[PDB]
Design an enzyme around this catalytic site. Structure first.
Site, short mmCIF file in Angstrom:
data_model
loop_
_atom_site.label_atom_id
_atom_site.label_comp_id
_atom_site.label_asym_id
_atom_site.label_seq_id
_atom_site.Cartn_x
_atom_site.Cartn_y
_atom_site.Cartn_z
N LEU A 170 24.72 96.17 0.26
CA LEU A 170 24.35 94.80 0.58
C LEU A 170 25.53 94.10 1.23
CD1 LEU A 170 22.32 92.47 0.38
CD2 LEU A 170 23.40 91.88 -1.81
N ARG B 218 52.31 95.61 -36.68
CA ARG B 218 53.51 95.00 -36.10
C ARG B 218 53.85 93.68 -36.77
NH1 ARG B 218 57.71 96.41 -32.28
NH2 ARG B 218 58.35 94.50 -31.19
N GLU C 110 28.82 91.39 -8.04
CA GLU C 110 27.43 90.96 -8.19
C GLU C 110 27.26 89.46 -8.39
OE1 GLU C 110 24.78 93.41 -10.59
OE2 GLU C 110 26.23 95.06 -10.48
#
Ligand SMILES: [Cl-]
Ligand SMILES: [Cl-]
Ligand SMILES: [Cl-]
Ligand SMILES: [Cl-]
Lengths: 385, 385, 385, 385
Positions: free
Chosen positions: D125, D272, D367
């Site tokens: 497209l 951590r 899109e």
């Protein structure tokens, strides 16, 4: 006008810009791909004093104003983030710490070369186990006949390799309170040894590819008595001052990157057309441009202010933290909006906007994460009233 | 020192702020709930020449720089938003418009009283059908023998019911092209007419309660020849110039309000404790404080810059828009955060933060909404690509 | 479909909404200015069983799902935030607490009156010295012969002055460590006492004017032995559960207000014209409308989900916190944008958008600030992994 | 419960996730570096019916619901964004278009191979000149003897170089008004031709390295009569429907990537520590975790909703756009925060968070850009009431 480039600045930045466009810009994309440390441009930049920008001319440096040095960092960053980080860190950290806490003897021994570029500096503070709570360094510096025995490992140290002069932080005495571990730390400056200092494998980064970042491993490394920088167990306090200075530089780096991204999107938007008109005529695009422009303008005034204070011998810990935080957060956002404005092309390496974002992204982490700076800022606001 | 208060500024502001703390601060809360116009404070502020701040002493003004005027607006706003708006609009719109396009005769006729505060100025541009698209004014002025006949309605005019001098924009001649309605508009300055000007009821507002706001209905109002301000049909260009100056004032008003909110939350955060400790220690609160302080500093730098450019006689349309946009947005968010920091108390009127927000909220709308400003900024950015 | 109103829901909401539009909506503006508690509306709403929405029919309740109750709260909030709060608090706090931890004897004694609206319920947890840190209550309950003695103060209690039934949390037993204070707290349910309970003056609030909010001063208040609600010293665990149920109600209230604001701005933008076109055609406005609609749809799905989990007797602390946090923040932002879209009109009380924002602003504070909810969420997330 | 995985969904997802962890996760990092199309994984995925997920079993597809397909796309994106885009595009675009507009002959001709994965599909497209305003296509189709001749260039076409089936949009008839070019476009479905179709020249991307993205050069490409997909000149209308379906897929892709980043930061944070305590104990970290979790849960609900509307054969243009916009923006935000939480390690490629961001960044563009989606949403909201 204060916020503008003075005639004296326009005479140093004018020729520096031409050089940047002609010798740095062209190979920026390639360097991002190759990641090859640009030794040539480093020596080539040193010519403008760039690598000793804040060093007194007496020591070989260019003795420039912190304000001027910042604008040059911005300029460099406008074309090459990697170079900007190398320049900013070399000056602000390694060199800056020596110039700040060094005895006349230590200064004379290092500054001349550093400010020259013939020797690059590495500032070892960050370790693998303490990425934020710096004062919690585990690297040690035990007293030994003749000097000290440094044992530890540094992480993500800019110029980890390529470094001729090193400055390393290490605990030499108890805190004593687990809380205030900022006391008991000492700094050690020295030239690249031949034993006891290993340079880990080059780290692959999200951006700033060409900048040198390496891990440092110190296996029983001996340094002369003339290595201790500042008062034993008081080096961390010099560290904070060094960072304040560093932050101003990083802020300018951020602005440079953000301004580039903005200028690119501005030009693109004006040309690129959609629905019968320049995509710039759409508020979805114009609003992004306006927002970015405004914030980068504010980011710049903030680091100029911080730099002005520093040169005036007035406090600027709050102002440098404010400038770095704002410029970093604002630049990264501007870069992201540039990617969005370019749309599909913003996602392709053929164009610079994705690199801008990747390069700028580190400014919100290095030399105090945004989160760290907010606590620094809040502590100052609170201790005030 | 550019960004800090100079010796001449401090000489004015030192005593001005003392007056603000003692006379203005005590009753701001009460004025917000009663909406009673403080004629008393207007006259007292006028003794500092703040009602003719930018007017040359030659015309009975104080002859201050735009920088100092702006700082004074910020100071007032810190304690009373409604008063800050009263001062900023009187000076920037009605008075500023007369000072800008007025002949020497009109300036002599209007400025002395406006500057001394004996007569307050009302600037009628906005109409029920057009605010952002001001160029689409519907009010009309017909050239009659001996002067003009005014017919139309003005909406949301500050000082609309208490003013002694009015400045109204009205259509005099066709565009003629619908695309450029801006061309063909004229401005008229006249003293409070005994007939022809009907004032609508004081509108109930979200905040700035004691600020006089009203609808003006012009019914065949007759004004003499000496009422025409600026070239006939050229009034819109003076309007835009007036707005650029007005936006600097609004930006400072916003900083004032935001600074007040932040300072309040700071004080509260340092004292109010939760979970066995001052709520300020929680990063959730500290981050809010840091962010707000940082943006306000940037906001202040922005308006100072814009003021500097205006006083230098250089363009500042873009810089005034950027200041007003950033300041208002930043201020409103800081006020909203202050409400949040105070929690339940921030929702009750016994404390000022809910008022700070209601007052500052207007700064993102008046004298050009933030949306309008972004377009102004984008267009200027695109013309110098 | 799940996210849509089912058959039984529509049969209830269809006529309920018609009632709201005709009876509640006409006077919402006036109630916001006068603050008069709407007893007529409370009674009319009660005929729909809304004051005992979740109470089993066996106890005179309506026996509705939490999902339907939430939709009803949303519907009310769309027209009157004050009433929605009244309904949400009465049901979720006082009634919900009695329904949750009450013995069959207590339920029979209190629920019939609460569920019919004959007696409104007040839930006193928050205190002047503690809100977010609820476990730090200062109110005390002394075990006496025949019942208990209550002494302390409660802050910002909904229905505090109009309640016929109170549920008060008070320290009965000392906690072990200065951390697990949540243990040793007890709850007491009792009818309005002739002596021992003094209601402070109605507090002036930013919004939700007609919502009854008051400070409660308990002085040697005696409650029979049957007043103890739940296990002695274990009341805070029921409080936490009650709050989970409450946050779903508040989330729905926020959606309602935000939806009303968006719908109004949508209606306005479609009609209001500027620069020769409806303001809606400008992306500066269209973007605001799109973002708000999208977040509100997401907010609704969130509260619907938490309600479904609750109805399934599944854990929903995390989910209710997520719904309330997201809905309140989204709704407040949508209301702020609706004010912006209306421009100058958004700042005047003749239009409802300024009320929508003032009303919705409380949803980010009550039932647990957004800051508190984020901690609640963060902790649940860390436990599961 | 609706929002949860149902029995039939869990039957598929349980084994699918086991497959993903074992076969896809281990090679993700390496594929991001090499860009090597994973044919083995395509084949292994196809065994799950993944490449014909929405295709009816009659045509050799898996015949699953849109919500199940979406959950599968999210699951894949959790471990490999490139593979998610590969699956999403193939199904949603090329295959979806044929399934939607194809005649029984065309579907029987293409669906079997597409659904089995023996033939991947490319959907053309977008062009170098028209992306946003897709109707402004320049590729042209000319009616020849027994077929058509196509000439044009398509850009950024997924599976463009590895496809076995192509669907290309080309104008066959002039539009009546340039403002409505959506009329006159046609779609053509055909297998990889011998001549007339030249593959673009691999442009490097910011992320999703291994996803096949290429420019398509059509030189007098011939296609039989049976190539015309849908009604002549009415192709764009089917295109709009195809995109609505595609957006649901992309929304799920975004969620998967965001969830991966969140989970990683969640796991990291727990271990951590900073300042002698897990960094997760700091609100700075915990607030980020909470915000991202909440938004991602909202994003997931939105795409499940859109998926169900489509499955129910009801309108879902607004809902698919809302889901895609919300998920993409939320996911990219969560990924950026994940990078921040890891700090310096977030900037090094040894860890996945930087790739998560790079991969996710495309979901805000592909899109339909967030900007385009906002207009779509606004138009619907306005056309409403
Ligand atoms: Cl100052
Ligand atoms: Cl519905
Ligand atoms: Cl699930
Ligand atoms: Cl299924």
């Amino acid at each position: 006008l204060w916020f503008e480039e003075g005639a004296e600045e326009r005479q140093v930045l004018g020729p520096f810009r031409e050089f940047l466009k002609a010798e740095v810009a062209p190979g920026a994309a390639e360097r991002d791909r190759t990641g090859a440390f640009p030794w040539d441009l480093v020596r080539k930049l040193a010519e403008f004093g760039v690598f000793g920008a804040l060093v007194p001319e007496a020591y070989g440096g260019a003795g420039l104003s912190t304000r001027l040095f910042a604008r040059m960092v911005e300029a460099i960053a406008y074309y090459d983030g990697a170079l900007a980080l190398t320049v900013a860190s070399h000056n602000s950290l390694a060199t800056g710490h020596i110039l700040l806490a060094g005895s006349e003897a230590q200064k004379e021994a290092f500054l001349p070369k550093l400010a020259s570029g013939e020797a690059l500096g590495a500032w070892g503070l960050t370790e693998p186990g303490s990425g934020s709570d710096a004062a919690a360094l585990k690297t040690k510096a035990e007293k030994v006949e003749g000097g000290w025995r440094l044992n530890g490992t540094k992480q993500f140290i800019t110029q980890g390799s390529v470094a001729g002069v090193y400055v390393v932080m290490a605990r030499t005495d108890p805190p004593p309170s687990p809380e205030r571990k900022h006391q008991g730390i000492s700094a050690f400056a020295f030239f690249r040894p031949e034993r006891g200092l290993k340079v880990g494998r080059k780290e692959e980064k999200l951006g700033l590819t060409a900048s040198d970042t390496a891990q440092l491993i110190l296996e029983d490394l001996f340094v002369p008595e003339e290595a201790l920088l500042g008062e034993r167990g008081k080096g961390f306090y010099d560290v904070l001052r060094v960072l304040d200075g560093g932050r101003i530089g990083i802020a300018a780096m951020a602005v440079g990157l953000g301004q580039a991204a903005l200028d690119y999107a501005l030009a693109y938007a004006k040309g690129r057309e959609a629905f019968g008109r320049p995509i710039a005529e759409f508020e979805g695009v114009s609003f992004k441009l306006a927002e970015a422009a405004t914030e980068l303008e504010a980011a710049r005034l903030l680091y100029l202010k911080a730099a002005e204070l520093k040169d005036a011998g007035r406090p600027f810990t709050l102002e440098a933290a404010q400038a770095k935080l704002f410029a970093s957060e604002a630049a990264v956002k501007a870069c992201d909006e540039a990617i969005q404005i370019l749309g599909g092309y913003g996602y392709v390496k053929d164009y610079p906007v994705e690199r801008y974002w990747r390069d700028a992204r580190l400014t919100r982490i290095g030399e105090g994460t945004s989160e760290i700076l907010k606590l620094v800022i809040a502590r100052r606001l609170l201790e005030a009233v």
